[PDB]
Amino acid sequence: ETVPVKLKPGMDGPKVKQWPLTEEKIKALVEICTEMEKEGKISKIGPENPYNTPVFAIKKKDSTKWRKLVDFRELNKRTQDFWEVIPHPAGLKKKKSVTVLDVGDAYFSVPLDEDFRKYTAFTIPSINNETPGIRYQYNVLPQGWKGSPAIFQSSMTKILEPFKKQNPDIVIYQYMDDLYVGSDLEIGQHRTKIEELRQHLLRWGFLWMGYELHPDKWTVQPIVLPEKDSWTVNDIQKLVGKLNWASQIYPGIKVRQLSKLLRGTKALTEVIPLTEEAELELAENREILKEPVHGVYYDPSKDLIAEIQKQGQGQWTYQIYQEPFKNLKTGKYARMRGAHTNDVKQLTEAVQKITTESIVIWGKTPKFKLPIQKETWETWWTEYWQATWIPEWEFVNTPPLVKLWYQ
Amino acid sequence: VPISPIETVPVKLKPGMDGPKVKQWPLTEEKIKALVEICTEMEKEGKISKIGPENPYNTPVFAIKKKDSTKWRKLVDFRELNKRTQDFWEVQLGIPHPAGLKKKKSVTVLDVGDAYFSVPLDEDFRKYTAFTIPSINNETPGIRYQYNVLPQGWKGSPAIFQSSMTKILEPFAAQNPDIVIYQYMDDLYVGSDLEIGQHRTKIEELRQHLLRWGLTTPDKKHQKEPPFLWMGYELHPDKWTVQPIVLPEKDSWTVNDIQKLVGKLNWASQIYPGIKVRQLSKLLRGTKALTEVIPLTEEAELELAENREILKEPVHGVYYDPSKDLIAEIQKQGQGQWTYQIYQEPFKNLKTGKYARMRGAHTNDVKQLTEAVQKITTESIVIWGKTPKFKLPIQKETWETWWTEYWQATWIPEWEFVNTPPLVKLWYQLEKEPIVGAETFYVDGAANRETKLGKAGYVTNKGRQKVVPLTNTTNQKTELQAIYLALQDSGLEVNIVTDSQYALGIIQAQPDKSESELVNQIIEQLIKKEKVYLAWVPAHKGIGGNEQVDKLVSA
Ligand SMILES: Cc1cc(/C=C/C#N)cc(C)c1Nc1ccnc(Nc2ccc(C#N)cc2)n1
Ligand SMILES: C=C(C)[C@H]1CCc2c(c(C)cc(O)c(=O)c2O)C1
Ligand SMILES: [Mn+2]
Ligand SMILES: [Mn+2]
Numbered sequence: 003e004t005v006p007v008k009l010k011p012g013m014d015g016p017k018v019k020q021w022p023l024t025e026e027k028i029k030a031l032v033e034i035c036t037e038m039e040k041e042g043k044i045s046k047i048g049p050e051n052p053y054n055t056p057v058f059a060i061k062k063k064d065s066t067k068w069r070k071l072v073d074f075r076e077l078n079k080r081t082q083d084f085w086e087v088i089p090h091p092a093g094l095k096k097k098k099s100v101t102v103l104d105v106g107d108a109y110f111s112v113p114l115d116e117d118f119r120k121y122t123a124f125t126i127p128s129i130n131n132e133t134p135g136i137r138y139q140y141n142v143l144p145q146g147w148k149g150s151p152a153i154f155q156s157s158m159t160k161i162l163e164p165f166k167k168q169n170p171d172i173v174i175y176q177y178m179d180d181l182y183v184g185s186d187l188e189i190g191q192h193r194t195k196i197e198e199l200r201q202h203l204l205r206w207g208f209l210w211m212g213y214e215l216h217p218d219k220w221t222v223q224p225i226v227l228p229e230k231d232s233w234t235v236n237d238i239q240k241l242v243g244k245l246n247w248a249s250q251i252y253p254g255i256k257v258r259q260l261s262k263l264l265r266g267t268k269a270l271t272e273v274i275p276l277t278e279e280a281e282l283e284l285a286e287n288r289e290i291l292k293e294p295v296h297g298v299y300y301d302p303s304k305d306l307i308a309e310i311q312k313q314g315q316g317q318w319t320y321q322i323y324q325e326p327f328k329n330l331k332t333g334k335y336a337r338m339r340g341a342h343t344n345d346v347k348q349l350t351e352a353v354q355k356i357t358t359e360s361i362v363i364w365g366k367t368p369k370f371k372l373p374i375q376k377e378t379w380e381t382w383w384t385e386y387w388q389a390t391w392i393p394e395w396e397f398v399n400t401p402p403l404v405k406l407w408y409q
Numbered sequence: 410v411p412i413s414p415i416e417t418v419p420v421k422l423k424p425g426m427d428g429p430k431v432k433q434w435p436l437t438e439e440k441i442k443a444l445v446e447i448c449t450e451m452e453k454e455g456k457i458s459k460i461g462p463e464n465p466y467n468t469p470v471f472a473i474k475k476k477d478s479t480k481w482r483k484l485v486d487f488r489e490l491n492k493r494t495q496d497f498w499e500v501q502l503g504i505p506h507p508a509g510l511k512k513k514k515s516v517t518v519l520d521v522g523d524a525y526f527s528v529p530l531d532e533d534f535r536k537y538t539a540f541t542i543p544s545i546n547n548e549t550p551g552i553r554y555q556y557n558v559l560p561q562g563w564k565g566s567p568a569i570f571q572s573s574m575t576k577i578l579e580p581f582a583a584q585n586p587d588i589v590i591y592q593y594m595d596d597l598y599v600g601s602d603l604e605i606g607q608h609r610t611k612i613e614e615l616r617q618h619l620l621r622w623g624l625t626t627p628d629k630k631h632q633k634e635p636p637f638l639w640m641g642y643e644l645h646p647d648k649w650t651v652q653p654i655v656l657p658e659k660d661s662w663t664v665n666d667i668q669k670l671v672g673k674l675n676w677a678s679q680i681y682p683g684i685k686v687r688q689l690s691k692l693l694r695g696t697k698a699l700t701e702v703i704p705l706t707e708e709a710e711l712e713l714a715e716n717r718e719i720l721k722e723p724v725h726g727v728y729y730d731p732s733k734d735l736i737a738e739i740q741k742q743g744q745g746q747w748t749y750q751i752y753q754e755p756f757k758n759l760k761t762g763k764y765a766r767m768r769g770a771h772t773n774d775v776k777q778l779t780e781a782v783q784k785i786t787t788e789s790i791v792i793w794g795k796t797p798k799f800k801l802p803i804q805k806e807t808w809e810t811w812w813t814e815y816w817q818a819t820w821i822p823e824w825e826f827v828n829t830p831p832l833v834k835l836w837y838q839l840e841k842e843p844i845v846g847a848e849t850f851y852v853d854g855a856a857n858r859e860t861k862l863g864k865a866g867y868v869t870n871k872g873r874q875k876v877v878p879l880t881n882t883t884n885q886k887t888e889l890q891a892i893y894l895a896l897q898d899s900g901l902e903v904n905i906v907t908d909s910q911y912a913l914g915i916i917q918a919q920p921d922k923s924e925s926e927l928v929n930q931i932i933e934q935l936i937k938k939e940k941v942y943l944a945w946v947p948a949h950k951g952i953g954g955n956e957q958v959d960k961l962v963s964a
Contacts, residue, residue: 025794050418050420129794131791135500137498239946243947266954268870271843314813373818375779375783403945
């Protein structure tokens with residue numbers, strides 16, 4: 003049977019243009035859709051259906067099996083809002099380990115309400131516009147649709163009752179196509195319970211992949227002031243600048259003693275010995291920075307904003323917040339990936355990592371502000387994307403001064 | 410002999426709307442007899458059907474003489490029904506670009522101006538297509554008709570016809586992967602490479618395939634044969650171009666004339682290499698309104714004149730050979746203009762093109778080159794489904810220095826340096842640490858919001874000082890002026906300390922050309938220095954060099 007669904011009142015279906023696809027992606031999508039059509043998952047549609055949602059292809063990693071990904075951002079925003087009868091696992095973020103599981107295939111075993119199907123239309127375009135684009139619409143619950151985990155909930159709730167009752171300490175959370183499973187087990191039983199879980203699912207009617215995370219191992223990032231034996235006028239100028247900035251987050255910060263070191267027009271490279279009034283003030287200020295911020299709270303009706311700064315030689319810093327200067331999370335990615343060759347691949351990898359963390363902690367994705375030209379991002383993100391969801395984003399074109407102060 | 414019917418598409422009016430109820434216009438006795446004759450055969454052919462008085466919808470019908478012929482033609486004005494008809498999925502959004510097509514030995518053109526009326530219109534939607542032929546003298550109830558097939562002029566006819574035609578051709582194309590089929594309009598075009606011997610066979614098989622739907626296709630030699638005039642181009646069996654581009658010879662140019670010229674040069678730029686249009690589009694800075702008869706700067710005539718020497722003789726592009734690699738070459742022209750050519754074999758261009766920077770006051774060559782590359786990349790994906798290999802005028806070393814130090818993430822796909830001046834280069838590099846032994850200039854500006862008077866100056870560690878009185882100026886301006894003074898009065902190496910976020914935001918943006926001559930002067934100064942370290946400090950935090958110079962310019 004089919005639980006009904008409608009759009010938010012005011013609102014017609016999505017009419018989003020399909021963006022140019024490379025030849026490799028088109029062949030992959032043609033092959034995939036051909037077999038999904040055979041299987042009744044999707045059906046060809048006519049011109050009386052004016053809706054459209056973008057679609058592209060992504061090879062999950064270290065592999066050669068393409069996935070088809072539909073960008074339901076617009077439909078999601080546009081489809082009414084599906085309360086049931088979750089708010090959040092405040093302890094998923096606490097659990098030693100967490101394994102992420104692709105359970106999206108389950109969705110294709112529930113039919114979609116015939117009156118809503120038209121809204122899931124998508125086009126596989128042709129190179130150089132030479133033949134008409136192949137049009138299709140979903141007949142079953144589609145992956146990437148927010149209605150999808152919601153409607154299927156009931157069915158997933160009872161599909162997991164056995165495992166959940168026999169393992170009352172394991173935390174299982176579900177976001178879009180993804181099942182998040184967290185436990186303090188030692189990292190080898192943890193795997194047994196997982197590869198159990200899926201055998202317990204793959205009985206129950208590519209879920210073999212795993213992405214292990216360690217929330218207890220994340221990796222926050224306060225502000226730090228340098229510890230030096232000899233300070234030049236420039237070191238002190240940079241220090242006073244950083245402290246002036248931090249005083250916008252922490253009220254007790256004070257500079258005056260450090261500022262009064264730089265009395266006179268001195269050469270930037272001149273060494274300046276610190277007064278005891280200075281070295282006290284610097285000390286009290288270090289203390290204040292070890293305390294956490296004041297009045298910082300999450301307000302689940304508000305959007306999460308994520309900012310990212312390129313710190314060079316492969317490092318990237320970021321902050322998540324809802325209110326300016328009220329950081330809920332800050333971090334750094336002095337990882338490898340991506341370069342030393344490719345800036346954009348690194349940025350794409352960072353966005354995915356931050357999104358994953360945001361899902362685990364608050365159960366929703368943040369709106370990204372990206373240090374890159376819109377034209378450069380749009381032309382390349384899909385070539386490195388590997389997640390089944392897609393967050394929102396906007397572009398930053400003015401270099402932020404606070405760049406250094408977060409590294 | 411049985412024939413498969415053509416399934417109809419369910420059509421609806423937009424929600425909340427009802428059919429059209431437009432009044433029929435009064436016609437001349439002559440036009441009515443003509444319409445009656447015309448409608449009579451259409452009805453005999455099944456295209457339309459007489460309807461009762463129940464139907465309350467109406468659409469105006471007209472009669473237009475055909476280029477002064479002995480014949481008449483009927484025009485049903487569906488503008489009003491079109492506003493109330495649902496939206497459809499246009500699958501002829503874009504036309505394919507000539508540079509993307511494959512070369513075909515043989516290409517036949519089959520007409521289907523008849524198969525268009527074998528396409529039925531959804532039964533429940535027919536009532537909305539009602540129209541009325543007025544009666545002679547208005548003495549009898551006008552003849553009422555409604556359509557049974559896709560009406561010419563109705564919003565959905567194109568989409569429904571094209572999709573119906575595609576659905577029929579779908580199995581033929583698939584089964585015959587050695588031919589290409591394109592449904593532009595009412596004539597069907599089929600190309601191929603196989604010897605004309607068997608290419609004629611394929612055509613006969615297609616006509617046979619179309620007979621399954623009782624669509625006949627009319628067994629003559631269509632008037633259309635290579636070359637074809639299509640979408641502003643000339644398509645030939647092995648080559649393509651634009652059509653004829655002719656630049657008027659004029660003693661007077663008015664906003665329109667220049668807009669018309671820019672249009673031709675833009676359209677021509679896809680195959681004619683080198684085309685420039687900056688000095689022209691610059692003369693149309695921004696108004697709506699023809700005409701004005703604006704004059705041509707000594708650059709417009711020089712830049713345009715160079716155009717004529719490009720379009721002097723015909724230039725043709727080749728077609729795409731999938732088995733061969735695509736290569737894109739870019740050259741800087743200056744004034745923020747760039748030109749590129751895409752080819753697979755040396756000197757044999759598939760297509761060419763230009764790029765122009767967007768609105769902005771500060772920019773640099775590297776950023777412009779990058780934008781050009783992204784544009785070419787996108788266009789390439791659309792036309793060939795792949796990214797070309799790039800040949801660019803910039804040294805690998807320059808590019809590396811640039812992207813590793815730029816605050817934004819950036820990327821260019823697989824490319825190679827091509828040594829053809831003018832090369833793109835980095836004009837100056839700020840230093841990462843303060844310079845030892847170099848004089849430290851603490852700069853500042855200030856201006857009175859009201860009087861607009863300000864001061865710009867600096868003080869250094871060596872006691873050097875300066876404060877200059879300024880008129881007609883803003884805070885942001887004064888702060889840029891102070892930096893300029895420090896640059897002017899310092900040696901080849903220098904440390905500059907400012908408190909202006911605005912000035913830093915501009916130099917951190919790393920421009921090599923600007924719309925503000927102030928910034929241009931500064932740029933010119935940076936270029937002449939050996940080493941420059943720009944430092945920033947917060948205003949009013951009790952700092953030397955800064956607290957002093959601030960007092961000197963505040964007044
Ligand atoms: C887009 C298109 C327009 C017309 C025609 C439209 C009109 N009028 C005719 C055809 C057959 C096609 N389609 C394709 C697809 C792939 N390669 C080609 N090659 C190709 C086309 C025409 C000539 C010529 N002469 C040579 C090669 N054409
Ligand atoms: C509140 C103040 C002390 C005044 C006076 C100087 C002054 C002020 C401001 C806003 C900005 C500057 O960049 C600056 O250099 C100033 O000297 C404001
Ligand atoms: Mn200032
Ligand atoms: Mn000042």
